[PDB]
Amino acid sequence: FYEQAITTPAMAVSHIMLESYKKYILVSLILLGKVQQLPKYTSQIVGRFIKPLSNAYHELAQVYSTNNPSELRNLVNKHSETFTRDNNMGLVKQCLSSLYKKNIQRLTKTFLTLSLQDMASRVQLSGPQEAEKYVLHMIEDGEIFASINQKDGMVSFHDNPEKYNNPAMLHNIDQEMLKCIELDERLKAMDQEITVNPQF
Amino acid sequence: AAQRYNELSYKTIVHESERLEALKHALHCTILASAGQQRSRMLATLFKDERCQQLAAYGILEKMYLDRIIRGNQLQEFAAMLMPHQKATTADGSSILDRAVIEHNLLSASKLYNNITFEELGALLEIPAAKAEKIASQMITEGRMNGFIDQIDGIVHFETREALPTWDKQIQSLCFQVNNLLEKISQTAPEWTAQAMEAQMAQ
Amino acid sequence: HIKSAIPHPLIMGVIRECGGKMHLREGEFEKAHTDFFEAFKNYDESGSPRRTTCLKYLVLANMLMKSGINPFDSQEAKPYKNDPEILAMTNLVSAYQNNDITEFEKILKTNHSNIMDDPFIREHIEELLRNIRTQVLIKLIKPYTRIHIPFISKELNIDVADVESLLVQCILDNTIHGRIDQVNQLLELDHQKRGGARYTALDKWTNQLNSLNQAVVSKLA
Amino acid sequence: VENPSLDLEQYAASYSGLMRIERLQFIADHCPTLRVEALKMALSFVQRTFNVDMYEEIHRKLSEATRELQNAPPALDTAWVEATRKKALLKLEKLDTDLKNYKGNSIKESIRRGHDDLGDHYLDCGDLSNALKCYSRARDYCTSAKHVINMCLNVIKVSVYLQNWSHVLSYVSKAESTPEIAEQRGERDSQTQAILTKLKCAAGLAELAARKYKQAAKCLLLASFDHCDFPELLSPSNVAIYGGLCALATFDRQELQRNVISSSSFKLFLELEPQVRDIIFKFYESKYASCLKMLDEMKDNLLLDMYLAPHVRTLYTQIRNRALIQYFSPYVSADMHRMAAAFNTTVAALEDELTQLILEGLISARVDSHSKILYARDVDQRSTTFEKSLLMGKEFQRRAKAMMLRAAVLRNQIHVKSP
DSSP, X not given: OHHHHHSSOOSSOOHHHHHHHHHHHHXXXXXXXXXXXXXXXXXXXXXXIIHHHTHHHHHHHHHXXXXXXXXXXXXHHHSHHHHHHTTXXXXXXXXXXXXXXXXXXXXXXXXXXXXXXXXXXXXXXSSHHHHHHHHHHHHHTTSOOEEEETTTTEEEEOOOOXXXXXXHHHHHHHHHHHHHHHHHHHHHHHHHHHHOOOOO | OHHXXXXXXXXXXXXXXXXXXXXXXXXXXXXXXOOOHHHHHHHHHHHTOHHHHTSTTHHHHHHHHTTOOOOHHHHHHHHHTSOTTTTOOOSSSSOHHHHHHHHHHHHHHHHOOOEEEHHHHHHHTTXXXXXXXXXXXXXXXXXXXXXXXXXXXXXXXXXXXXXXXXXXXXXXXXHHHHHHHHHHHHHSOHHHHHHHIIIIIIO | OTTTOOOOOSTHHHHHHHHHHHHHHHXXXXXXXXXXXXXXXXXXXXXXXXXXXXXXXXXXXXXXXXXXXXXXXXXXXXHHTTSHHHHHHHHHHHHHHHTOHHHXXXXXXXXXXXXXXXXXXXXXXXXXXXXXXXXXXXXXXXXXXXXEHHHHHHHHTSOHHHHHHHHHHHHHHTOOOEEEETTTTEEEEOOSOXXXXXXXXXXXXXXXXXXXXXXXXXXXX | XXXXXXXXXXXXXXXXXXXXXXXXXXXXXXXXXXXXXXHHHHHHHTTSTTOSHHHHHHHHHHHHHHHHTTTOOOOOOHHHHHHHHHHHHHHHHHHHHHHHHHHHXXXXXXXXXXXXXXXXXXXXXXXXHHHHHHHXXXXXXXXXXXXXXXXXXXXXXXXXXXXOTTTHHHHHHHHHTTTHHHHHTTTTTTOOSTTHHHHHHHHHHHHHHSOOHHHHHHHHTTOOSSOOOOSSSOOHHHHHHHHHHHHHHHSOHHHIIIIISSOSTTHHHHHSOHHHHHHHHHHHTTOHHHHHHHHHHHHHHHHSSTTTHHHHHHHHHHHHHHHHHHHXXXXXXXXXXXXXXXXXXXSHHHHHHHHHHHHHSSOOBOOBTTTTBOOBOOOOHHHHHHHHHHHHHHHHHHHHHHHHHHHHHHTTTOOSOXX
């Protein structure tokens, strides 16, 4: 929705576009690991006027890319007045928490069985207790595929949700195919409408 | 030697005792080794001979023909029928005859499986399971056994060769087994012959 | 430059020996084989100061060229090999060709004097051993989906480290198709291979490009 | 950064020139207390070859070193300076007058020879622009193709220090691909002619600078053992190090047995290199510990190799990564403790190395860091292709919503307009 609000053709800059762009960067930092590229058909005023006006948000993404939580904390405290002025303070806190989650998600690619103290030292959480909290939350929300061993104080990453033999996938693919079929009948209607009307 | 002796036994210029002499040596070459493929073709060609039915070991060739695992009885029968130089156990364990008998027994176990453990094939042919794996791998090395060996799971699988397109070939065979159902209609019981040739075919 | 001057003396086999010798220096047994081959022929022409030796190197060349098919097989070597001194070479080619390591090594160990004295034989023998063990392994591997490294060690009768080195060597060969658990020391081979899998993805990709061509145009004004 | 594993006696013997000055430069950059005596030997060297400007520069930096020798334990022969400089300028006028005389004599062999010799004396001055004039007026003023080759050889000897590889490589390729090498002979039919191996060294320096090192080693493959002589660039131990280690760093194991063991042209060069040969033996026998050990030992001495110094850090990192791939390849489950013993490392720092490789490269695995053990992984292509195809279906549906709403507002061609 924010992306579609930015793409709108524009000769003048409106405050709706500015705020949607700021919130676009925030939601893209939460949902994805980085800022999603806007299409080439986006207005010129976005890259000329809106981009340098919301400088703090691109600065926030610049500090987000270094994967350092304390530095992002320092930058959130730096421009805190600007983020509260736009009335989006809260989403930037979700960005901080998503950065922590991104740092715990980066551990699956390299580790299999990792200590809670090692995780607290690498992700920067202070204590194995907060590491256990974060891992448990992430398993419950379906963000990581891991298990907790309290006896040894270890975290065991599995990383195997599906082998693609369930009917579940059959039903998933059936539903996704029905969506593509709907789009094609919709696309057939759009194409027919355009063929009717032709130029003279 | 089997093709030598057999097609010397089929020629008619030679004396008749010498024809059946070449024939009985072709039967020696039947039983002393296990069957290679053209070998087995020549053995079945020997099986079509009434003069081989005149020979002493036609029951041995009969059990070769019916793909039968050779037990010790007919083993000792044709062991009474050998020449002592053909009874050579030259430090190979059991004899060339007998090792080839074990070859034919594993061969019949191959022709009838699709998998068998090293243990079930071992106790099947009265051999150790490790020796079953060993000699089975030596026959796959000889190629006349074919499949795939899982040492860890302990099973010499044969190439199982069974799936759903094979079952579609079995669907065409199910058309021919509706024809075999007509054969059961005409065949299995005579009251069933009359009444089923009435009911299933005319009604 | 022999090409330049052509007399035809008795000595002809010796120089041809040198070419093989050069290939002894080099280790290019392919050329040495022809060298000793013709040289041995010339020796037959001359006599046997060197003849048996030439044959020894020739057989050595055959093993290093790794083509045992015609060891003695010209016309003459077959009767020549009968010379018991040299007959051991026949045994080598046999045990090598037949790949009986016990027998082959037996001839090596038993006859240090006959076989082993040659520094080239002594030199190349390990390489030769690698080749033999490699082939025996090849024979061993085909039926197996999965195998134990220690099983192989016991089988081949060589050290596990040696086994691993040889296995890795086989991987270099691109012979082994499967992964090895180094910790567990076992080998799993992709006995049942399938290049079946790609096509679904490939068709998907082709369609994706189709989508690309379709989308860029349509979405684009 | 001081490595005492250098041989300056050989570089005094096998070499001379600016590199005798320049490797001291890396001494002057990083490797001190190996400086003052070779500075004075280089100062006595620049007492020859007509050079006074750089003579006084070596006297100046030797005075700097003398100020450093107010703590640790220079020569300006001004009579020589003025005498040699006036002789050199008067001989410049002599050879300008002789250039007039020989244009009066009109021998393009001798005229272009004078252009070559004047560019040689501007190398003797350090006037690379004036030597560029002279060889630029020796450029298309030759008689045979061999003389164009010799001209480009002299320009490449300048290009040792030019290294401006846009058109400096046009001169390098003007010696390489242009002059139909020895007019379809190959440096006159089995080269002893130190030209193509100079093109090996020139492409080595060039794609050292221009960083396509695979083609550089591809050049460095087939050097000839016959000549092996130049007192600034070509000694066969050093060029042997160049070719062997660039080929070890840039080429796959297919070619590492197929073109490194088989490289008979370069074979005697590795006969000059026993340690490179032993590193080759250990790496091909996957003996990672002592191989990467000797690698990183001579890494400091190839950091003493001034031009290889920035690139040896990249390439021995690649060779260590190549060794790690050589370990990781043939298994399904490798102990990292075995790997810690094999690569002379710990588990966890080794794990971070492997994680750095996990970021892009060939480590397909999961490490049970509860047990701290590697477990190599075959990523299933069925799972991979089904995954990417159905994620393509999800992106297909996001682009569906995109095109539906976007064309529902813009197939109308109606937008946020000017008011």
